[PDB]
Amino acid sequence: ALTKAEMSEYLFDKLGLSKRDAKELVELFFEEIRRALENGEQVKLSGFGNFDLRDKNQRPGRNPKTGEDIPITARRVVTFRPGQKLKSRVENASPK
């Protein structure tokens, strides 16, 4: 699967950057997304998708193994909303 190592490589070949910069840039990229998210801000990457934050209240849950009913504590989760352009490029994808 695609990893930072691979991404760092493409940046090295295609754009000819030091393996140092091609490495840090990748990290910064995701770190900047994480940051924006932890600060409660929405991330909208045109051509790709949006990382929106939703605040979920508490709801009934349980222990899949046994069945012990346990309440899923309220929380704020990160969701991904892919745009059409991306959705179109994947709708006919063949799982490798």
């Binding site: 950057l17 994480r34 790709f48 490029r89």
Partner: protein, 94 residues
Amino acid sequence: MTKSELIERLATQQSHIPAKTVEDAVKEMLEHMASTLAQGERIAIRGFGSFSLHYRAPRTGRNPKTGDKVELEGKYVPHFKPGKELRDRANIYG
């Protein structure tokens, strides 16, 4: 934060990296992530999250506005699963 705003922020911080280079990199990486998913391959970023593909069986859909039916072929859609760190840092509710 939009794609561009992302570039600006990254460009600002780094003083030893050309802004135009940051612009190219970001754009490239994303297009890289895109092609990957369109090739049927998943993305794995330990700590951040992972992008995969979920199958959508064929169904007799509808035109929500007119009500008319519409046959829909099987397809694949993107799916993201936030990594631990990402989940923790995002969840402000302790």
